[PDB]
């Protein structure tokens with residue numbers, strides 16, 4: 001799994017400069033989300049359950065991993081494997097997080113960034129979500145953000161957590177990528 005591997009094409013929404021963050025709409029197909037859930041399901045171990053796929057371990061996931069390299073412009077040598085969660089030498093510093101929603105969550109369950117410069121307000125945001133910048137889980141969407149400033153210093157605005165789900169069932173996959181080859 002090196003370099004960059006027909007490209008992905010969807011909608012990009014800029015969310016913030018602190019942390020620098022983008023929403024990628026329909027980054028995963030519905031078919032890809034359902035695959036990842038079912039492939040992960042029998043591996044899930046204990047809140048949330050989870051499992052880990054090594055970079056390049058799975059053929060369908062590997063296609064997606066290439067897509068992440070392409071959109072981030074960072075070669076696959078720098079990437080970790082894939083963490084899947086269900087809610088109920090090393091490459092140097094981590095620089096970018098990609099969080100992919102495998103299911104749509106009707107109410108609550110937002111990713112929240114409480115130290116972001118923005119807070120969400122009003123209709124359709126849970127009370128937890130209103131503590132910072134938040135993103136609704138929609139199947140196929142991906143939240144991309146940088147944990148370092150351009151000069152390589154820490155961006156504390158990139159701290160994130162999961163709001164409790166009030167209506168629905170939240171599955172997510174998280175890809176971390178480093179400044180250098182692992």
Ligand SMILES: [Cl-]
Pocket residue numbers: 099110111112161162163172
């Ligand atoms: Cl989350």
